[PDB]
Amino acid sequence: TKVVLGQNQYGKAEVRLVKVTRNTARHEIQDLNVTSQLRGDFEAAHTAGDNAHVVATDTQKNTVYAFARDGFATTEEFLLRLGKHFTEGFDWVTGGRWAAQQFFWDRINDHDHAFSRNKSEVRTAVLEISGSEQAIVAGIEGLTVLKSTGSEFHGFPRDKYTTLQETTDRILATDVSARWRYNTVEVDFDAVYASVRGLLLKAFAETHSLALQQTMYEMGRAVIETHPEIDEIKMSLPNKHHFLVDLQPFGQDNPNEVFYAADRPYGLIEATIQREGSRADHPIWSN
Amino acid sequence: TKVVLGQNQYGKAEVRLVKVTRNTARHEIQDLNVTSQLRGDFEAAHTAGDNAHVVATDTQKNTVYAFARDGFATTEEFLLRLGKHFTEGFDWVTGGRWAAQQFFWDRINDHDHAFSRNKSEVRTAVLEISGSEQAIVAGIEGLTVLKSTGSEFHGFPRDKYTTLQETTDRILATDVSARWRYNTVEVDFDAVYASVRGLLLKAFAETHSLALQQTMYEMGRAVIETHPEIDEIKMSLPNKHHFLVDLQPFGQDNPNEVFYAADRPYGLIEATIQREGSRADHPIWSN
Amino acid sequence: TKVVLGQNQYGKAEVRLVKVTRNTARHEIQDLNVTSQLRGDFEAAHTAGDNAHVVATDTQKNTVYAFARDGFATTEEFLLRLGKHFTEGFDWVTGGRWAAQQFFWDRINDHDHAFSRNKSEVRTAVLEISGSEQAIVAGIEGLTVLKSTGSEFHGFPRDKYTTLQETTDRILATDVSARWRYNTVEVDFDAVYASVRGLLLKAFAETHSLALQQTMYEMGRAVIETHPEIDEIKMSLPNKHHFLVDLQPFGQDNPNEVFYAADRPYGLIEATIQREGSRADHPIWSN
Amino acid sequence: TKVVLGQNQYGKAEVRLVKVTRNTARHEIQDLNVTSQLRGDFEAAHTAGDNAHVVATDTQKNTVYAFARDGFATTEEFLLRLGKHFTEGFDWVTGGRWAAQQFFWDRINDHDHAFSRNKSEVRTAVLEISGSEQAIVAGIEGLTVLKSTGSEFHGFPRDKYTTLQETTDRILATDVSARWRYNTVEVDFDAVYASVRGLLLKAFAETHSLALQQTMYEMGRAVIETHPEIDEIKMSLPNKHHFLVDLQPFGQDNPNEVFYAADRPYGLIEATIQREGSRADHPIWSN
Ligand SMILES: O=c1[nH]c(=O)c2[nH]c(=O)[nH]c2[nH]1
Ligand SMILES: O=c1[nH]c(=O)c2[nH]c(=O)[nH]c2[nH]1
Ligand SMILES: O=c1[nH]c(=O)c2[nH]c(=O)[nH]c2[nH]1
Ligand SMILES: O=c1[nH]c(=O)c2[nH]c(=O)[nH]c2[nH]1
């Protein structure tokens, strides 16, 4: 009978920006995919179509490019400027969500202005402003890893639907997707990203795995124990199955050498590793 | 300084199931992409690699196929059976999240056992159990719609970065992605899905749009007002830009006929239309 | 020692065009993905960077939109116009390849100007011009089909690497990818496309399959036998495996009802069905 | 008026193989996506469903894994083994087409058995056997490159649809997709691939580009001039547009710093650079 407008947000998504720094002959490249969405009083926009409060998504896009002209130290510093601009520039805009994917480039043979894409991972950043409060979540994704041994899986309950054989030697392969929330915007964003990346990789490789859940816990633990500015880190790790092919029918054996890398289905293990005492449900993990 | 395991879940993702009903010559097809994840006490599994509580993702997979043998009336009913099985079959399992995508098939010229895929839309369903609480969210995605007229956008503020020209006649194109939460399990799931689909399409097409926001509001309003079993519906609608090409440099006019369909960037308008008084932030939305 | 520039072509690829017909209240929609590439004397452009013969890809793009203004009955007609324009307008351009994907839209409840995308198939057209000769190849792709029965596979040879079991009842699923070459440009393109589509579907569903190769042959034969204007048709059909899941480990049988739809690998059966006497290797197929 | 079976081939496509070498604690990883297709006398299989000559695609799949058990020096040599096996092991099999994609992995901190994927490029190999002739085409794809300067485009004709302005400073970005045909199978496949990759990147980066066509020509020339075993190299280079954003309406200049990286459309420049006097129509290119 009675209808109400709940949570809502709008903006320009996937604004592909490439910023070249060339004050000198040694060019630098920053490559981003930016998304900007505003939150505030947009009641009349939805109920009557009154756009008095609707800062056009096209305008939001223009602002991204206009601000890029001044340059930015890091992706997070750039998002901070955008959110500050919109929340403060319009009285009816009380906050928003600004995010970006950062793509890496490597110089071609150390050339001053020629590069190739490093597609092995994608860095992410998300800024959320709610009135007087703001929070930043950084992350990494698309980083595929694999252990050819040093992985086990046994001791699991065996019910009517269980057929999986226990094993003390299997391949452990996953795609590293992690996102961590900072407890302060006063961070050396680039240095921490590199550190976290190394910690996750190290924990994955050096942990003798008794389960993907265990490996993930150790990856998240290393990060929390190492960075005081991080209150928690969330991870979503698929278990990309590599089946040891049965070669007995061909008169052969398969000593953990020949595998069939299956696409789907896959295991999906997810968890939040956090610093004792920190809040368990920050708003930034929603909408 | 103390590290602690927070929210977590695990299971098998994207189990592709095709169920054929052939007790009669008139074969029927049910096509799903199922994901199953459990929640409960998995503390030891993460901190010590003790898998006593870890129902193998392989087992969860086997269960999906075994349960499909008995058949199911709807996707939601199928997910309900899985959720009850795991939560009740294991004491340390207190809940979880079971989701599925349903793909449609049409008979080839009414053939008894030959079909073609209807890729114009994908139906979704998600069941979440938390203790004694159960919640179901159904939805639709991948349904692309377009209005060649009956759309306007003007009256928006103009700042230093605004260059967009007001208009009273433009193309409005989007991909309908909607999800609605049921307030009861006593629902004719297939009947409501077909009805909601028709209501979203009807509202999109018949509403003289003054803004995508207004169109989205009308689509949601229609659903809430028609179905007592729905407490809220969320929508994420991209505004897929179709630019009117300027042919004047060539001495030709373009009476809203020739357009360039851009990929990115795109506007992204999202909102929640709720039944007045209903829950503000159900946990099923955060996953 | 001696390097030579061989075959070459260049142009603008994937120009997204949406042409709306609104002479009256009953709007029509034509949605294309156009690619234009030229062939001729571009020796100096490659070897010396002399761009005198290089009609800019940007110009080719503009030409596509400029020609769209005048409208067009069929996709093939539109491509013919482009080919004629470039070959005759520049003396050093001796030929080219113009291609397009045509996307289908359906009216929303018979609305005058509101539509929904029919994503169940994509139509293709390719025009190649060489000197004074031209050829057109039309096609269909993305049309997924499945037979729940009426498919067998037995009688194949067995070697030491053979483990497949014979069967008289299996699911046969594929993606219909077919392309056919017209032996004249005087064709009712839209009518032949609709007919061919129908013939392929009929042969697929109605042929009791003893092999994917056999079904494909029948599909091709139906087309050649029905349309005099078609000299040959090439098909590429993957065999989308739907494995009958083994439920015996769970105490159940599986009477051809529960299947696992695997992604990869997949069988890939390809063939050219030709009209006795027609050309054996027309250049359009190579590119 | 009669129907004839023309060219045809069939087999198993995209067989995902991971071969782990673990003779010592220093594990090695070989990751391939293999496709196997046979050619020969399959007339009866198509016209009558007689499968006597049809070596099951499932059998072809099995052979891939069985052969992997013995290990292989390079991707090309693995394909050669498969091709010879099928062509020599079946009288009605006169040839075929075997191809593979090779995915690269890097050790994590020089770890003995932990690796991460290098997704910056994918290596390819295609082998076609016809009687006693064995033809191999190696290649690379997915290698995105970009020059921030050192690229110009001017001197092109300005026809009636030309609006593009001349420029002496622009970004040149492309996806390096190249394939070269060896004139002998006696090649150090890994060494030549590494050399070719280096030469393409070197020519792309150091050539002051007056056009994408020129840059492509220099890339191919370098390969042909350096490797006697290569008869020709074909490249398909998209011109991925990075449009210099006009910030003048916002009161700012933009000294080649802020760009909009567009998705579509894109220029597509392609050409074959051959060794003078070599075969210009090898069958392997038709596929
Ligand atoms: O590390 C694992 N965790 C699981 O929950 C699981 N389930 C499974 O089948 N294999 C694995 N492996
Ligand atoms: O319906 C619209 N809403 C917006 O917020 C917007 N912004 C924009 O540029 N075009 C539109 N259209
Ligand atoms: O290097 C180029 N070659 C072209 O053929 C072309 N066309 C165009 O618009 N830009 C470019 N650039
Ligand atoms: O119709 C088929 N053709 C094949 O060549 C083949 N190979 C296979 O394993 N199954 C099938 N099915």
mmCIF file of C-alpha atoms in Angstrom, chain B residues 10 20 27 35 48 60 69 73 86 94 99 101 110 117 153 168 178 181 194 196 214 220 233 258 276 283:
data_model
loop_
_atom_site.group_PDB
_atom_site.id
_atom_site.type_symbol
_atom_site.label_atom_id
_atom_site.label_comp_id
_atom_site.label_asym_id
_atom_site.label_seq_id
_atom_site.Cartn_x
_atom_site.Cartn_y
_atom_site.Cartn_z
ATOM 1 C CA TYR B 10 32.796 -21.673 2.443
ATOM 2 C CA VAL B 20 15.583 -33.401 -17.404
ATOM 3 C CA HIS B 27 10.555 -33.668 -21.846
ATOM 4 C CA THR B 35 26.371 -22.152 -5.254
ATOM 5 C CA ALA B 48 44.550 -25.138 13.364
ATOM 6 C CA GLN B 60 28.304 -30.086 -0.912
ATOM 7 C CA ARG B 69 17.312 -36.586 -8.633
ATOM 8 C CA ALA B 73 9.035 -27.501 -8.505
ATOM 9 C CA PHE B 86 23.033 -28.689 5.873
ATOM 10 C CA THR B 94 24.197 -22.785 11.993
ATOM 11 C CA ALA B 99 22.180 -19.245 -4.549
ATOM 12 C CA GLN B 101 20.995 -18.681 -11.586
ATOM 13 C CA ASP B 110 7.176 -27.117 -29.975
ATOM 14 C CA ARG B 117 18.372 -21.218 -25.137
ATOM 15 C CA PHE B 153 16.651 15.116 -18.635
ATOM 16 C CA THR B 168 13.381 16.682 -23.833
ATOM 17 C CA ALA B 178 16.585 -6.200 -9.899
ATOM 18 C CA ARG B 181 13.088 -9.838 -0.778
ATOM 19 C CA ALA B 194 6.760 -13.664 -14.180
ATOM 20 C CA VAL B 196 7.429 -8.832 -11.351
ATOM 21 C CA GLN B 214 12.108 8.443 -11.602
ATOM 22 C CA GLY B 220 9.833 -0.526 -7.884
ATOM 23 C CA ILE B 233 13.111 -4.421 -4.247
ATOM 24 C CA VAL B 258 21.540 8.010 -35.889
ATOM 25 C CA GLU B 276 6.696 1.393 4.470
ATOM 26 C CA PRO B 283 21.583 -8.961 6.548
#
